[PDB]
Design a protein around this ligand. Structure first.
Ligand SMILES: [K+]
Ligand SMILES: [Mg+2]
Ligand SMILES: [Mg+2]
Ligand SMILES: [Mg+2]
Ligand SMILES: [Mg+2]
Ligand SMILES: [Mg+2]
Ligand SMILES: [Mg+2]
Ligand SMILES: [Mg+2]
Ligand SMILES: [Mg+2]
Ligand SMILES: [Mg+2]
Ligand SMILES: [Mg+2]
Ligand SMILES: [Mg+2]
Ligand SMILES: [Mg+2]
Ligand SMILES: [Mg+2]
Ligand SMILES: [Mg+2]
Ligand SMILES: [Mg+2]
Ligand SMILES: [Mg+2]
Ligand SMILES: [Mg+2]
Ligand SMILES: [Mg+2]
Ligand SMILES: [Mg+2]
Ligand SMILES: [Mg+2]
Ligand SMILES: [Mg+2]
Ligand SMILES: [Zn+2]
Lengths: 186, 268, 105, 119, 46
RNA sequence: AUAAGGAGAGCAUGGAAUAUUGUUGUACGACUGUUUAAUUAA
RNA sequence: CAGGCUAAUUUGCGCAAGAGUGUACAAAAUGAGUGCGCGGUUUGGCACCUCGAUGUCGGCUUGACUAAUCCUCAUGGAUGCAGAAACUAUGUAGGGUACGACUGUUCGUCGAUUAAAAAGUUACAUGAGCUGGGUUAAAUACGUCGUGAGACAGUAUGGUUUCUAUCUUCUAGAGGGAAUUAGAAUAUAAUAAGGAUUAACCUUUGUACGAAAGGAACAUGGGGUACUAUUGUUAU
């Protein structure tokens, strides 16, 4: 299938990124949502560009997510994956788990449904990369510089249907646009 | 013994007769060995005496609010240089402020008389690493003696607190409030064990007493502003003492000395 | 007289993003370079207050979007935290203000 | 400042209305905005969480004033939180309310991806 | 290494040596074996 | 059982006292009373 | 009751030997019944000794010390060390070893965090420092035993916990003083005595290793919406 069109005005890192997460990671469905027209800036940055991808399995997601963080680290962007466990962060969780089993005697192994070692959603927040001056009326110090924020949300098929963050931010968009028209009028 | 491992009479002066040039091992103690194991830490340049004037924030362009303390230099002169051949170590004596001639004694009036300096308010020594740190006597040090971004250490006498208890002095927890306690809320509790612990209070035991009014050093404090006309040197963070007290400011011992160019420009 | 008084409604625009926070001024602490102002607003159904340093660079601008009819008889208006005197949400005055600018401009 | 025995509000669509803090995770100081805690569901709302279920949560709102690096001090009218699992993945799917701005610097993109308002 | 009070040779390549003896201590008796490192033994406790 | 539940110019019709945790359920004794003056009031 | 002597016993240990287990192969690990020992924690024996006790002990406050190590640091062995984890052992006690529920208590038990939620000695270390959970009563009810008065290592409720510090030690601050020595003002060194002392996370070319699943060591950096350093972003 084709690739998600790049919204006009995106940074120069947006075109390689989409190609990377598609031609090198192997995400089934990719949809880039343009949410840079929200009156109140959301609690992620001025102008978000949520990119949604689907992973084959939790293990594939954990590798792809960590593979993307290292791909963006070679360009200067320091992304923080919300859901990607660290090397030693996993050791301690395994140590405690195995340690308790030793004492108990393997009486909780079949009862460890939720351990914190597995996740089906990872949110790679790249942050607000390109900052620039706005144009406002202040007679105030200056203009409140804004910038585009990039957020890559990689999750599994099962987890991408429960959350349904595509219709959440889509509904938020149209709502903030209608309210904008009220002030202007037309 | 009285102090340490030495049983030598305090009135005996044998230092000059045990020389390394005669084939003796360089002693591990003494002024020579004390300077050698402090060579790296010792500051290259002298310090300045400043007066704590208050606390504020340094608002920076684009959004930075940095809490800072203001220290003012009030006629800081160089009064005397302490060489190693005469005193046993390298240091510079710095003076601050002024004092009325009537209040200055004759022993000190004749001391400034031999230098051409007006009587100062206070005097303090700043240890330097080698002979390159000694400055001409009678030169004034301005806030530009430092540069913005230079970390320094500020030594000042802490606020006096009189006779403190166990809670305020040593951070003792105290005892309960209402569950049957009997006249013992802020008291220190036990002071020791019993016959198996010496039937005595052990030296170094923490007890109530006087707190404060002692020297305290805050290390690694950057220099945010340097204003010559005002005479102030704004440092980050807090500094020991009250407003109007004199403090000692010098380069940080735990940080590399300023670049060679700066140490030479200030001397130039 | 023309300055912003306690009890008025202000609007602080933030440098990084432009996110404006509107609220009714409850207090003004004059402390040299750290002078601050307290704005109360109901975001959602939650009452949220905000201290702002007027001499910081993270505040792009402050504007008076609605003045108090009569001068307040108190230096501080901490009584506006109680449901009795709570002004509630300030979105009404913000919407009515933006309209003026757009129509005029 | 959230401690043990503290009661907080759940602002996500998890089926919890009132939770009680049972442990401040990873620190000795009391939990502030953006801190991880372990709570106990005390009430519900008429795979939901049943009363008495122990879950991890994140503090999003604190009545205690919180001072930002720029000198801005924020205060909310109540203490709120969102239930999360030990992995760190929101149990709910939508937030109804305003969260503090300290979740942005503590890497809580998942909570901030549910389109919560910010103060 | 195994700290025994009775160290013995367990093959033809095991050698008895006294190491770590200097002007400050007396050292220990060691069983050093290049063929099998499981024969490494020491006599005495620090 | 006064059950509960609904209610009585400025921040406040303003001080003191009235004015005390409330509710529910158990064990024991029906109840009000009496008891070791001056460690046990049940 | 504590101290004193002893060490039968122990929930305290070590060493020597090696039946046996370890697919193989004694000593990677494991170690029957035993022998030679150290040590003074548990239950005991004795009785030099009248004294703060029958749970001899709990909590609080404040420690000091020990090292037989739970965490953090260095490290040998491991046909049973590929990596990771874990096991065994050798160095090492610097700093830590939290919080709550139920249990009269420590015994204990559980909950959820944590790098870890280890032990012991000091007259339960410490009540002329606190508590009274205790250490003892007289009241009352029940149970068991006795002809009865009563008894009980029973059960439940209730039940006055003195002291203005003389001496040593200790924490602070002072009067006088003897100092190479006639006495002072100011700034001061050698040296001495103490204080500070935690841990985690990302960062290896997801690299070395591995069939794969997995997955390190080493090293640098993470002080700046000030300076500076560094990484990006746009403009020249
Ligand atoms: K009292
Ligand atoms: Mg004073
Ligand atoms: Mg207290
Ligand atoms: Mg003695
Ligand atoms: Mg004594
Ligand atoms: Mg009765
Ligand atoms: Mg009576
Ligand atoms: Mg009575
Ligand atoms: Mg065999
Ligand atoms: Mg060990
Ligand atoms: Mg090895
Ligand atoms: Mg290994
Ligand atoms: Mg040390
Ligand atoms: Mg005790
Ligand atoms: Mg006593
Ligand atoms: Mg009786
Ligand atoms: Mg009877
Ligand atoms: Mg009573
Ligand atoms: Mg006396
Ligand atoms: Mg000295
Ligand atoms: Mg460390
Ligand atoms: Mg900068
Ligand atoms: Zn051999």
């Amino acid at each position: 299938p084709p690739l998600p069109d790049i919204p006009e005005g995106s940074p120069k890192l947006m075109e390689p990124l989409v190609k990377f997460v598609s031609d090198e990671l192997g995400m089934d469905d990719l949809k880039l949502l343009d949410l840079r027209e929200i009156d109140p800036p959301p609690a992620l940055g001025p102008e978000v560009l949520m990119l949604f991808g689907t992973a084959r399995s939790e293990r594939h997601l954990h590798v792809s997510a960590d593979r993307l963080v290292r791909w963006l680290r070679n360009r200067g962007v320091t992304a923080k994956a919300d859901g990607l466990l660290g090397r030693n962060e996993l050791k301690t969780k395994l140590r405690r788990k195995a340690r308790k089993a030793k004492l108990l005697g393997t009486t909780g192994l079949p009862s460890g449904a939720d351990d914190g070692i597995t996740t089906g959603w990872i949110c790679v927040n790249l942050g607000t990369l390109g900052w620039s001056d706005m144009e406002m009326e202040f007679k105030g110090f200056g203009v409140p510089q804004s910038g585009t924020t990039l957020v890559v949300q990689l999750m599994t098929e099962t987890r991408r249907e429960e959350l349904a963050l595509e219709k959440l931010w889509s509904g938020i968009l149209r709502r903030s646009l209608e309210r904008q028209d009220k002030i202007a009028g037309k | 013994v009285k102090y340490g491992w030495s049983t030598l009479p305090k009135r005996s002066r044998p230092t000059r007769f045990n020389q390394v040039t005669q084939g003796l091992p360089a002693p591990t103690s003494g002024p020579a060995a004390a300077l050698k194991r402090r060579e790296k830490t010792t500051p290259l340049r002298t310090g300045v005496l400043a007066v704590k004037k208050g606390m504020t924030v340094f608002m920076g362009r684009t959004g930075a609010r940095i809490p800072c303390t203001v220290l003012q230099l009030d006629r800081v002169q160089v009064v005397a240089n302490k060489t190693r051949a005469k005193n046993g170590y390298w240091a510079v004596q710095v003076g601050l402020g002024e004092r009325r001639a009537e209040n200055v004694g004759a022993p000190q009036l004749g001391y400034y008389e031999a230098k051409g300096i007006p009587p100062k308010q206070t005097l303090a020594e700043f240890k330097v690493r080698n002979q390159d740190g000694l400055l001409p006597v009678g030169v004034q040090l301005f806030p530009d003696w430092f540069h913005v971004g230079q970390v320094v250490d500020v030594r000042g006498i802490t606020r006096g607190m009189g006779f403190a208890g166990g809670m305020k002095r040593h951070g003792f927890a105290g005892q309960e409030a209402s569950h049957g306690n009997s006249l013992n809320h802020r008291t220190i509790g036990s002071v020791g064990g019993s016959q198996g612990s010496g039937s005595r209070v052990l030296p170094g035991k923490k007890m109530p007493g006087r707190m404060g009014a002692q020297q305290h050093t805050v290390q690694n404090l950057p220099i945010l502003m340097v204003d010559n006309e005002l005479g102030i040197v704004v440092v980050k963070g807090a500094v020991a003492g009250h407003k109007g007290a004199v403090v000692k400011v010098q380069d940080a011992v735990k940080k590399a000395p300023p670049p060679e160019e700066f140490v030479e420009a200030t001397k130039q | 007289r023309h300055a912003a008084r306690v009890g008025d409604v202000l609007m602080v625009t933030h440098r990084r993003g432009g996110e404006p926070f509107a609220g009714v001024c409850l207090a003004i602490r004059r402390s040299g370079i750290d002078t601050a102002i307290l704005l109360r607003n109901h975001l959602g159904k939650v009452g949220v207050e905000m201290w702002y340093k007027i001499y910081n660079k993270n505040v792009a601008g402050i504007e008076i979007i609605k003045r108090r009819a009569k001068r307040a008889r108190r230096a501080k208006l901490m009584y506006m935290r109680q449901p009795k005197h709570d002004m509630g949400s300030v979105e009404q005055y913000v919407f009515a203000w933006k309209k003026m600018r757009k129509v005029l401009s | 400042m959230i401690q043990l025995k503290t009661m907080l509000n759940c602002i996500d669509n998890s089926g919890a209305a009132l939770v009680e803090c049972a442990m401040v995770v990873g620190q000795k100081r009391h939990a502030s905005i953006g801190d991880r805690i372990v709570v106990v569901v005390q009430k519900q709302r008429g795979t939901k969480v049943k009363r008495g279920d122990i879950r991890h949560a994140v503090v999003v709102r604190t009545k205690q004033k919180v001072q930002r690096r720029d000198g801005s001090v924020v205060r909310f009218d109540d203490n709120a939180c969102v239930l999360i699992n030990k992995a760190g993945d929101p149990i709910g799917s939508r937030i109804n309310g305003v969260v503090g701005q300290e979740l942005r610097k503590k890497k809580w993109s998942k909570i901030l991806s549910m389109a919560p308002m910010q103060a | 290494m195994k700290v025994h009070s009775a160290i013995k040779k367990r093959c033809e390549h095991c050698k008895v040596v006294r190491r770590k003896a200097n002007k400050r201590q007396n050292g220990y008796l060691y069983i050093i074996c290049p063929a099998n490192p499981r024969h490494k033994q020491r006599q005495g406790y620090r």
